[PDB]
Symmetry: C3
Subunit: 202 residues, 3 copies
């Protein structure tokens, strides 16, 4: 009776973005920000705006969530996995630079449970910004107090990593200039604000 | 049990503005922004701040809503009708110009169902700025993909209620300076932010 | 089932700050802002950002609350009492200056009902700033339209004693003044008042 996630909230007639209660299978009720983009609903799992929220958090906090749902936040790996579980989901990354240009990229992904350290497997689909995250590789999540070779760009924040590493840490240190997104070719994008958004494939 | 509208929320002791769940009679639960103005509760049905949200939406999305309840949004004609068909409602239009002067006007009104293309019938009650919307006339809603009648120049873009008289009154129009409000006998008002608000009479 | 306060919300696994419904015993449902500070949940009862909200409100609005839960607001004395009742709670005051620094101070307190004019009785516990509010004294609430006086209290609703002093966080914004008597005057840009159980 309580919707499982944002797509079913949308299909039940809530077509506006905002904060909603959901309850995925085998889970407690918790609140999410549902973000409708061009008529399609997403669950917002990460949001960064100005660096005010410290993202160099513990493993426990990256697992259960931190921040403010009306501002900068991280939903929580346990909550994200409760949504995704064994399903193929779609991940959208939205970056805005300091010149206020908007870039997006979408991936098809699978996510493992806490026993796999929430291993992420991505394949890029579309976007107007080149990919910076290794594709078709098992990416292991790590925090400052919970290391999985340690990537130089993982020194701050919780992120998914492989030996190839890279400048791709959207949960990295917000320098007070923003964040960095270095694609495979070499072009590095200065990032002022980020969103990470998911929705089921079907 | 679940409050019917923002006035119900306020009367049950919740006097802060914010996003709340409501369930109008024989309707599904949905969320609204309750806006209390000078100690008086209102249900906010549209809000425009800086023109970041595109308002040149489909008929389908004007029926069911679009946008961000904590920002720029349109509640949706089906949901507006679900609220108002319960009783009789006052419509408050609030306009902010670029000098940050607040202007307002309040109307008595009734609203038809989808079978009438949500026809609006307005009577101006009070305000501090001239009314620009034809009164005591069936105003038919139209969008870019859903035309009822004659195409008004201020209605090329957006979902709005129109009559043969047209006029510069389309608060869901293209946001440039900003939006335009002008009565037939009055001067043009350049509008930076808008609100549309309803509560029972 | 509706949780009774922000501690239950957090313990149930919602560790993000924000607006949530709650329902203390013998009370209607109402919404609060749960603020998570260093992994500990607090109920935000007062919040001021930039003076956009007018805090020279009437007694009835100070009892039932006013403002925006995601912005500047006052939760309301009746709702604050619904949470605390005759329990001994903990109060935290958060003061942010204009130079971006943050100052805090924590109190043990108990609270009286409306026929008491919501008397506040507190004593400081910790804090990186001196206290400007009289400790271990019964401070009674008053608004511009409801007296029980201090010149710092001509604007806003606040708890007062004969000591007075610039400690009115609900006072007139320009920003706000926090000064212990014969001490440094802090000009405050933003304020937070938070409570949680012991």
């Amino acid at each position: 009776m309580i919707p499982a996630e944002c797509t079913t909230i949308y299909n039940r007639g809530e077509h506006t973005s905002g904060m909603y209660a959901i309850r995925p299978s085998n889970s407690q009720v918790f609140h999410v920000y549902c973000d409708v983009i061009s008529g399609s609903p997403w669950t917002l799992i990460q949001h960064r705006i100005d660096g005010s929220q410290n993202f160099n958090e513990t493993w426990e906090n990256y697992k259960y969530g931190f921040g403010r749902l009306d501002g900068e936040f991280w939903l929580g790996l346990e909550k994200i996995y409760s949504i995704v579980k064994q399903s193929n989901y779609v991940l959208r990354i939205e970056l805005e630079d300091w010149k206020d240009n908007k870039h997006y990229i979408e991936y098809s992904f699978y996510l493992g449970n806490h026993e796999t350290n929430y291993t992420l497997h991505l394949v890029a689909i579309t976007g107007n910004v080149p990919n910076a995250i290794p594709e078709n590789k098992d990416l292991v999540f790590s925090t400052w107090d919970h290391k999985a070779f340690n990537c130089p760009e993982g020194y701050s924040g919780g992120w998914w990593w492989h030996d190839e590493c890279g400048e791709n840490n959207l949960n990295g240190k917000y320098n007070k200039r923003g964040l960095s997104w270095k694609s495979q070719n070499g072009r590095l994008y200065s990032i002022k604000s980020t969103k990470m958004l998911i929705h089921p494939t079907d």
